[PDB]
Each structure stands twice: as C-alpha cells, then as structure tokens.
Design a protein around this ligand. Structure first.
Ligand SMILES: C[C@H]1CC[C@@H](F)C(=O)[C@@H](O)[C@@H](O)C/C=C/c2cc(O)cc(O)c2C(=O)O1
Length: 348
C-alpha cells in the first residue's frame, strides 16, 4: 500500500499521487488523482472500529450522506475498504476536491461584502435542505465549510448530526457539550440538549460575525467561559426570555448576574452592511424560540440578490427517527458499516 507520513493510506490503484491536506476525526485527509474520472479528489481515512462511539459517528455520517444530494453539501463519490469484515481495518471516503476551508481562508483573507453575502446564502441554502430532512448538523463552524476556486461552498462532516427531537430537548444546567465551543448556543449551557433546529442557526450567526471581522465573536477560553462572552455582547436577558427558562438552577444563575448592556452590532462591526447586521441580530437571538428560522433567513433583505425558493430544494425522504445505534456493540456497528458501504465494491 502507498504510505503517507508513516501511515498506511491504502487507496490504490485507482487513486494515486497522494498529498497530505489535513485531518478528519479518525484519520488524515489527502488529495489524490482519480485515474478513472481523470481529476484529483479528496480522501478521508477513518479508523473507528476499536471504539463504539467512533463507529456511531462513522455510520451516522455515511447513512446521511448516501441519502442527501445537494449542491451545498459535499457528497460521497466512493468508499474504499477491504472485501471482508475480517480484513477491514480502515475505511476511506472519497469526495470532491475543494480549494480551501473557511477557517484557513479567514486566517489571511478579508472578505468583500459580496463574498460574505454569497457565502452566507450558500450556508443557509444547504441548511434548508438539512433541516427539511429533519436532521441537525450540530457542529457548524468555519473549518467544516469548504470552498472551491470560484467560491462555491459545501458543508462537510455529518458525524455529529442527529435527527431533530424538539419534544425531548429540555435538560439541566451546565450538563451539555453539543458543538464546538465558540459556536455553541447559550441554551446548551442552560437547559438544552441541542435537539432543535435553532442550534444550527446560532452557529451560522457566529460564522457570519466571524466573516465580518476575521475573528470569532464569542471566543470562550473554556466551557464555562463561553456564556460570559455571549452575555457580554447580547446583554442581560429580558424578563420574558428568563420566564421561558423554567429550570431553577439555570434561571437563578442568570438572575444572580449584574446587569449587562447590549453592545450595538454597528459598534462591533462599523464597516458592515446594515442589512447584514439586522440578519445577524436575528440569528444571534438569545431566546431559541424567537430566533430566526432558516427559511426566514433566506428571505431576509440582505440575501435579496440570491433568494429564490424554487431553486432552494428540500429533501425527498426525511429521516423519521434517529438511527437506533446506542448500546449497539462495536461489532454490530462494524457489520452495519460494512453493509452500508457495499454498494461501492467492484462487483455488486
Ligand atoms: C474530506 C473532507 C472532510 C471534510 C471536513 F469536514 C473535515 O474533515 C474537517 O476536519 C476539515 O476541516 C478538513 C479539511 C478538508 C478539506 C480541505 C481542503 O482544502 C479541500 C477539501 O476538499 C477538503 C475535504 O474534502 O475534506
């Protein structure tokens, strides 16, 4: 097998001339030349089989992406693994080769307002499809947004996704970890399991703010610090919004804080389009029930140059229940991953 940085990366003979380009959750990402389709591609190595949770994250993403088909979601072109379960140690997922990700791009490039508008439109267009399938991405952040050389945007990594479950979303204070910290909605720390669509809208609002300034808007230094940063800009929640938090530990924490004023968006972003800041405000709304939904966001005046509901498709076959995976031992999960990837074997 071909090797990359002292690691097996066993994708040949179809895929050759490998280059390291980054990291996934359970292995490295490489570019490679596809000798059949005569184009370079991206390949993610996955090694999940020693751990139940890794197999869960792997199976969930494969099931989602094999059903999804959307221009702003990067799909699965091929899956490489051994012909038998005994011989299968790793799995490789082949996908379109993009130019960069938005995290890298924001490190060194200032975005024009036209780019911010186009990027945000494409994020929301893909999110509309995801949510229409009754699915939550639950880890939207710049490093999971890929861009090609003409600034087409695709959403990547569905390993943390779940089927939406708004009727079972309530939980206690300081118990939930959903998403990457800086993009985590305030209710995660207060009373939410992250089972409703508004969790994704908060993350998109954080990404919009980061596109406006090239810095994260809520850069918590650790778990507990995150809510300090959110409240420092949004200010103290209203009485109405506090009354929506029935959990006493969460509500009394907020009541124990000194008054904090709202920081006006146009003082934080003096160069920004005023329509962009209006939409930002609606996405970064404290109360998740008052927070703008994805189809409302697409119809906001900031996006008027792009908005076209007939060209913003929804899913043909939504997922009805979460795939029943927990307590399933890793052996049954390996068997399910094997079966789910069988369609790509030479043969079939
Ligand atoms: C194989 C998929 C994985 C998608 C992604 F969600 C991750 O795994 C994250 O860790 C990313 O931050 C890694 C970056 C990947 C990447 C970078 C490019 O410059 C061009 C590309 O085509 C890809 C790509 O396809 O990545």
């Amino acid at each position: 097998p071909e090797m990359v940085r002292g690691q097996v990366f066993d994708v040949g003979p179809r895929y050759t001339n490998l280059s390291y380009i980054g990291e996934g959750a359970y292995g490295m990402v490489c570019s490679a030349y596809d000798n059949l389709n005569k184009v370079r591609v991206a390949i993610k190595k996955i090694s999940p089989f020693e751990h139940q949770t890794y197999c869960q994250r792997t199976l969930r993403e494969i099931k989602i992406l094999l059903r999804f088909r959307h221009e702003n979601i990067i799909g699965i072109n091929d899956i490489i693994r051994a012909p038998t379960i005994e011989q299968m140690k790793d799995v490789y997922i082949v996908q379109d080769l993009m130019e960069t990700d938005l995290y890298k791009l924001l490190k060194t490039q200032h975005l024009s307002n036209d780019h911010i508008c186009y990027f945000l439109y494409q994020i929301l267009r893909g999110l509309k499809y995801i949510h229409s399938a009754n699915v939550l991405h639950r880890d939207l952040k710049p490093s999971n947004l890929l861009l090609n050389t003409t600034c087409d945007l695709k959403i990547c990594d569905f390993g943390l996704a779940r089927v939406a479950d708004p009727d079972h979303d309530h939980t206690g204070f300081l118990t939930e970890y959903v998403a990457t910290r800086w993009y985590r909605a305030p209710e995660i720390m207060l009373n939410s399991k992250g089972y409703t669509k508004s969790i994704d809208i908060w993350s998109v609002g954080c990404i919009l703010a980061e596109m406006l300034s090239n810095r994260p808007i809520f850069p918590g230094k650790h778990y507990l610090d995150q809510l300090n940063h959110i409240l420092g800009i949004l200010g103290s929640p209203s009485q109405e919004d506090l009354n929506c938090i029935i959990n006493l530990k969460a509500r009394n924490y907020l009541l124990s804080l000194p008054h904090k004023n709202k920081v006006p968006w146009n003082r934080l972003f003096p160069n920004a389009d005023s329509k962009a800041l209006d939409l930002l405000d609606k996405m970064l709304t404290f109360n998740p029930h008052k927070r703008i939904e994805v189809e409302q966001a697409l119809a906001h005046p900031y996006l008027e140059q792009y908005y076209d509901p007939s060209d913003e498709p929804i899913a043909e076959a939504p997922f009805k229940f979460d795939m029943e995976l927990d307590d399933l031992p890793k052996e049954k999960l390996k068997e399910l991953i094997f079966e789910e990837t069988a369609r790509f074997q030479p043969g079939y």
